[PDB]
Amino acid sequence: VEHPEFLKAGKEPGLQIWRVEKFDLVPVPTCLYGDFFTGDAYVILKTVQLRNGNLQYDLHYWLGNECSQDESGAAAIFTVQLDDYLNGRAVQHREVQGFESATFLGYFKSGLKYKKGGVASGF
Amino acid sequence: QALVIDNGSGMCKAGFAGDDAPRAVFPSIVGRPRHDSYVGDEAQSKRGILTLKYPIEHGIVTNWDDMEKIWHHTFYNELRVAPEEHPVLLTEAALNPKANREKMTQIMFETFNTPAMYVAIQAVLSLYASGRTTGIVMDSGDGVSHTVPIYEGYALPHAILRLDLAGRDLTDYMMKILTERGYSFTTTAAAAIVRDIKEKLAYVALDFEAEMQTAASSSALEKSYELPDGQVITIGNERFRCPEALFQPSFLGMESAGIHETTYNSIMKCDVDIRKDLYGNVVLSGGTTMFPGIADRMNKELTALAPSTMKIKIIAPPERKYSVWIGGSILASLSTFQQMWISKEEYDESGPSIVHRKCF
Ligand SMILES: Nc1ncnc2c1ncn2[C@@H]1O[C@H](COP(=O)(O)OP(=O)(O)OP(=O)(O)O)[C@@H](O)[C@H]1O
């Protein structure tokens, strides 16, 4: 994978968020982090530095209640690809709207938000 | 414009990456003269003067000349493309023999001159189509059933189980029990008629015995079926007995474990720490999983097999007849896929064995 966003991923501690947009992986502007279109699917990478200083990766794909099949499929595959790209070191988590894990919910300090709509299907 | 071809034992599904459904779905049959060739519905029509053959048995190619005819028809007659112009995604069984993967690759580049190709495991494509990276797929088609545990994007080959009990078997079985009922299917169109009764009227009983009783003591479960000639026959307990045989292979004289148990058995072959996510992501896939009641019955049977506190989820998308195809469409559409392909250039460099390194 030469995907430019791959070159960026998991470089330093932090949270990085991408949205699936027509079969591509597209970064989310940092000032919109936490506001999720329930019509869309997203890939979230959480990079944590341990006491060691060692980099740890948790990779969450979040599926909007109304995201289309191509969107949730792509988010799942992109996740596998990114994990592979990070030498299989990412732990992968499927995050469904309305049922996200506490760890994921914890990533957004002012609480995540849902909003209707999104990018049209790639199909 | 990549193409996606999903070769099954009974049916070939084919289309264009980026479409939400296969454009072409036709029988995986090649007909040659008893005393030139034909594929699909045409072969089936002219079957009185042809020897008809299935190039794929139990999901595995057993006849390459005839497989070539299937692909030639797929490209030229069904999709109407010149294959030299398109990357092609093909699908395979999870445990597809090494030599078969090579031969596919070779045929694609040498016979059809594909500029690019890739081979994907069918079960994995269904998982991806359900928007999961981890789960267990129960894939039941015309010629074979498999339970295929997948973790974080990749199948666990050691954990995979194969059940040689599928649609064709269910169709034969329906023919037997309708005959036993007193009916007689004697025309050339017997198998198609009984296959159609299966697909239109069969369902899986939540409680098999209780259904047997309901059926024996009332007429409520009975359905009318109009034959090609206009004769109307009644389908009673055969509706749920036919697919019961997925759960009870003894109905067919097989010592086999049923689909629920096979699924459990696969999960149990996997590292303890992933089983929770397998039980909670049991994806049904293939034509033979289209029986109404199947998911509920799976859920019930896995529930009875697993600890009581285990969360069991059966996922049975309405479009699971084409799950595999749809996962290929999606996969082959990704911006990231142009780097996954085996290119012509790579093929001329390493030959068919390139597939073992590029595709998995
Ligand atoms: N609605 C239905 N209910 C029950 N069975 C169905 C239904 N629709 C199709 N089938 C059966 O599904 C089988 C075809 O499914 P599919 O195309 O998944 O198989 P395949 O891929 O050709 O077979 P395999 O996967 O075994 O190689 C046929 O036996 C067909 O009769």
Ligand SMILES: [Ca+2]
């Ligand atoms: Ca969307």
Ligand SMILES: [Ca+2]
């Ligand atoms: Ca990993």
Ligand SMILES: [Ca+2]
């Ligand atoms: Ca199949």
